[PDB]
A paper describes a structure:
TrxT is testis-specific and associates with the lampbrush loops of the Y chromosome. This extra domain is mostly unstructured, with a high ratio of negatively charged residues. In D. melanogaster, this C-terminal domain is attached to the protein core via a covalent link that stabilizes a closed conformation that partially covers the catalytic site. The regions connecting Gly107 to Asp111 and His120 to Cys125 were also traceable, but unfortunately the fragment connecting Asp111 to His120 and the last 26 amino acids were not visible in the density, which is also in agreement with the rapid motions and negative 15N–[1H] NOE values measured for these residues. Moreover, in the case of TrxT the crystals contain two TrxT molecules engaged with a symmetry-related neighbor stabilized through the coordination of a Zn atom (which was present in the crystallization condition).
Thioredoxins (Trxs) are ubiquitous enzymes that regulate the redox state in cells. In Drosophila, there are two germline-specific Trxs, Deadhead (Dhd) and thioredoxin T (TrxT), that belong to the lethal(3)malignant brain tumor signature genes and to the ‘survival network’ of genes that mediate the cellular response to DNA damage. Trxs share a conserved catalytic motif, with two conserved cysteine residues embedded in a canonical fold consisting of five β-strands and four α-helices.
Numbering used by the authors:
A (entry chain A), B (entry chain A): 1 to 106, 125 to 128
Write the structure that this text describes.
């Protein structure tokens, strides 16, 4: 399952506890159609990769600070992180690419 | 000669332009003794096989994304690729094996 981020200090802690794991952060809002469509597949991947991947979820309406720090301008946006380093940024609704990007490292509103 | 990779999109383009050729990617860093020793022999082979083999070079300190995607954990590491497929992975400093592996398909830091 996908862990909601309450604030920047929550997220900063999660990034350190993730250790060597792949971290994937999903920026979403409740008013975003494409966000809702891809969300089941993201939860499916989180179970398949639970030993290797940590999956975080940032609600942009309550987290303006985290959104500005990651330069999020569109939704959905998935940031792939390992060791506090941003490896790759991915915007859009292709859930087949999302699943592929998750295995290699283990439509658009606003 | 050996072509430096600037990013993942650079590398992805190189993999397609290489066509049917053998591609060899060398993962290295400036702080890696064994990397520096084998490097002349790699350049020698690149000239001998210039019509058949494309030789790419990825600096791991500036390319965390490519390193994670190829699961690089040590140096030097040579990935042998043909058609976007990874045929073989080779870690270590034996330049005689490197030359042999190059002809069949045409010490350790971190
Ligand atoms: Zn569950
Ligand atoms: Zn030359
Ligand atoms: Zn990547
Ligand atoms: Zn082979």
């Amino acid at each position: 399952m996908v862990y909601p981020v309450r604030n920047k200090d929550d997220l900063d802690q999660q990034l350190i506890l993730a250790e060597d794991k792949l971290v994937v952060i999903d920026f979403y809002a409740d008013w975003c159609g494409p966000c809702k469509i891809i969300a089941p597949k993201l939860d499916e991947l989180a179970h398949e990769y639970s030993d290797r991947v940590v999956v975080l979820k940032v609600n942009v309406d309550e987290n303006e600070d985290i959104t500005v720090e990651y330069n999020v301008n569109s939704m959905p946006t998935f940031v792939f992180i390992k060791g506090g380093n941003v490896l790759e940024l991915f915007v859009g609704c292709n859930s087949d690419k999302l699943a592929k990007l998750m295995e290699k490292h283990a439509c658009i509103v606003d």
